[PDB]
Symmetry: C3
Subunit: 194 residues, 3 copies
């Protein structure tokens, strides 16, 4: 499987754009885009690997991950002017990255040797903490404190993944159904809320 | 000794109720209770084990720790309506967990092979950071910024523990005197302050 | 080389004074000085060693590092009354520690076996996160959100270090030119801004 590696690259990239565009909201310099983007894109996975015991961390093991951020962030620096509202993009991109990181996070937490509960916990953790770091450093109130599905989207994503992978389904559809049960569920609330 | 394991279970549980009830203050969903409760209950110990070098972390080594949170948090979800003011419960429970985590934290920091100063530092760290994570993610000002004993209760708890364990006292009374010198001292300020 | 060890001791010390004096701004107790000072002085390096994979962390490996903080913080407790404005001292000391931690951070990130990009990333990281922890726990808005060079000073410091160490210059002048390109650049903005 190389699908999930792609989902991780897209989670890192998308979250990078979230942090970079957040840096656009705070009128920060380009280095702000690169740093904050790196912290948000990499952060969920880095905390995941820290608690799970992966050493060295994925972005220090392969620097490309941070470079992508450095790419994307810089890209966003030029294209932050284009989309308004940017915060909407924040919400939607956060939803996507949330889904992908929930599912893939649960996956790599499960292939370690950990239990299903740990898998779901890490699924929720990569996405949520990924958002958490950017929203903390950014200095604005985090998306978690608003209603109503943020944590439950990642929760049902990871839980659906683990549940369907328990019966020995093909893993690809576990990834798809996790991503769906997360992204769709979150999107419903981002549609009724906005 | 299995006493300190029980003190750790109670620190994790109590802090879990702190985070969950905080989630009640922010009108968050149940997943908020579970997540925030897990982060606050586990967080102090997880940071402790991270800096001390314990791999894998205690809750990934044994998932039961997070499950307890998942239990307690859910429990709190149903029983958050009952107690008002809830913030008082926050303060007192935080005091208890502070004491227990100061003492036990100093203990497990000392059995690693580290110095007495490191022991006290980790004693203060488990409790304080345990509160820190919940108060940061919650989006309200942390208990540390208010007067006057929060850090000194854990400090004198851990310091009393290490001091009495230096002379080779029985460890149980070091645990008791640590817990006392912490909880009583904090309670005096929570009595004169409220 | 023992120069960089001295630069690290000064980064830890100076950042300790930043956190301690911040504790002076929040009218916190002495334990606040010691704790917050330890968290800010040690924090950048501790996160650096965590992601890089250094176990045990530098201050648990040698407790002296925290003791210095305990020293300095206590010292600041007595000498916090003397200098006003204290926040100016915060800015300048933060600049110094920023420079030294950028350069030395890049250095020790490079001697691990990591790439140049990782080196620069860790250079920026030790300084920035060192400030981040104190500004988060302190409860005030972080220095990063203000204009304009904070991240770019550490960025050009670390980048100049790595760039001059790539051609095989003498490392001492790479340290000097990193420190210069960081501290001077930041100082220009702290001179035009104030």
């Amino acid at each position: 499987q190389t699908v999930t590696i792609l989902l991780d690259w897209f989670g890192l990239c998308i979250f990078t754009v979230t942090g970079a565009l957040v840096a656009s909201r705070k009128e920060m310099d380009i280095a702000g885009f690169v740093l904050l983007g790196a912290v948000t894109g990499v952060g969920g996975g880095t905390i995941r690997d820290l608690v799970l015991g992966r050493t060295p961390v994925f972005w220090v093991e392969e620097p490309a991950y941070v470079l992508a951020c450095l790419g994307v962030a810089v890209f966003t620096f030029f294209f932050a002017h284009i989309p308004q509202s940017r915060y909407r993009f924040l919400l939607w991109l956060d939803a996507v990255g949330l889904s992908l990181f929930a599912v893939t996070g649960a996956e790599r937490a499960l292939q370690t040797g950990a239990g299903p509960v740990i898998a779901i916990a890490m699924g929720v953790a990569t996405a949520t903490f990924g958002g958490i770091l950017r929203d903390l450093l950014g200095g604005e109130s985090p998306v978690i404190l608003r209603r109503e599905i943020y944590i439950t989207a990642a929760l049902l994503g990871a839980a659906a993944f683990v549940a369907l992978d328990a019966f020995g389904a093909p893993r690809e559809l576990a990834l798809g159904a996790g991503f769906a049960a997360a992204f769709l569920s979150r999107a419903a609330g981002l549609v009724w809320g906005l």
